[PDB]
């Protein structure tokens, strides 16, 4: 009537992704962790844009929407930030937001690429990830783009720009020993990269007592967070959600 004793084995760790394996766990917990990776890890992304002057071929909403998807290095600064609506400031402050300013005037006879390099933050710890660089817009001669922006804490459930992951590969039972999926012709199906079957075999023998365990993860970071940090913040956030629900339930019972 109690918790499992889950175990971790990291099979690969780079700056782009972490690949690991969780054993001795329910499928629901593993899927919830996989889901929290996408929807509930808070990062910093541009969410307030004031355009002082735009002469580009792209209208203002296009530029703002593109700026929102710029990923920002939010490794440690995100934890000490607060959500803006929770912050008591007069709408903005260094404790709930990070200011950006962009001012690019193409006064030359060559197409000026306005990239992420031109985004200038008021905080050195929160820069564009590429700072090759993400192209915001291209400008002709005599075209100015001048705006300020603010980037705030949020998570991917609200909007996909706060999604830190760039694809979360998730798997379990690579040889289909549980027959949670039924191949009409198992011969035709290529082996998973985690399969332990020899090539003369196409499918592990059926396991009547099996249960899903040994879930294989490959979490790729878009760049806002290191993948280690993505997984750790995900587990911390899910634990925080469960503890808050525990507090509310204790209040409701009392």
């Amino acid at each position: 009537p109690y918790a499992n004793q889950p175990t971790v084995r990291i099979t690969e760790l780079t700056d782009e992704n972490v690949k690991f394996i969780i054993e001795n766990t329910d499928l629901a917990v593993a899927n919830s962790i996989r889901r929290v990776f996408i929807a509930e890890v808070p990062i910093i992304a541009i969410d307030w844009v004031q355009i002082d002057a735009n002469s580009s071929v792209l209208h203002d909403e296009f530029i703002a929407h593109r700026l929102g998807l710029i990923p920002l290095t939010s490794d440690d600064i995100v934890d000490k930030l607060q959500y803006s609506r929770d912050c008591t400031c007069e709408e903005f402050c260094p404790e709930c937001s990070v200011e950006f300013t962009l001012d690019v005037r193409c006064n030359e006879d060559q197409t000026r690429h306005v990239t992420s390099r031109d985004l200038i933050s008021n905080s050195p710890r929160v820069i564009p990830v590429t700072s090759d660089d993400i192209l915001i817009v291209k400008l002709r001669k005599g075209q100015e783009l001048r705006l300020r922006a603010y980037a705030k804490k949020g998570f991917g459930k609200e909007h996909a720009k706060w999604n830190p992951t760039a694809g979360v590969a998730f798997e379990y039972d690579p040889d289909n020993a549980l027959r949670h999926t039924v191949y009409p012709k198992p011969e035709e199906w290529p082996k998973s990269e985690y399969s332990e079957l020899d090539e003369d075999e196409s499918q592990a023998p059926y396991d009547p007592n099996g249960k899903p365990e040994r879930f294989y993860y490959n979490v790729e970071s878009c760049g806002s967070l290191r993948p280690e940090t993505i997984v750790l913040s995900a587990l911390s956030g899910l634990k925080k959600k469960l503890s808050d629900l525990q507090t509310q339930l204790s209040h409701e019972i009392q």
């Binding site: 690991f20 917990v29 509930e40 750790l232 587990l235 469960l242 629900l245 339930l249 204790s250």
Partner: protein, 115 residues
């Protein structure tokens, strides 16, 4: 124009209870937990944890509508064990599990970084 603001899937407007408990009169020792501003993230994991308790006779959850952010969890236990007690025990076990997993994941990262 009828698009809801995106924040009304995890934020409680004023006068809204996060979680509400209602006795189920059809069967003895049965309760319905209606949790607002939650989804399958907590519903599925809590249901799976509750199913591991031997004293839980029934544990299920539903989202009554994908555009409405309620989850209803029905829990029925044996008649010596309140469903509320089972629910609290399930959450405590999940929290202990996730804390253990955090610790082991930090250790695994340190070992992989060191070599």
């Amino acid at each position: 124009m009828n698009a809801p603001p995106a924040f009304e899937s995890f934020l409680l407007f004023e006068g809204e209870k996060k979680i509400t408990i209602n006795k189920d009169t059809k069967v003895p020792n049965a309760c319905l937990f209606t949790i607002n501003k939650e989804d399958h993230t907590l519903g599925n994991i809590i249901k799976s944890q509750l199913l591991k308790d031997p004293q839980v006779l029934f544990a299920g959850y539903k989202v009554p509508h994908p555009l409405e952010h309620k989850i209803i969890i029905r829990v029925q236990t044996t008649p010596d064990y309140s469903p509320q007690e089972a629910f609290t025990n399930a959450i405590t076990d999940l929290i202990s599990e996730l804390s253990l997993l955090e610790e082991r994941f930090r250790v695994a990262i340190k070992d992989k970084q060191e070599g």
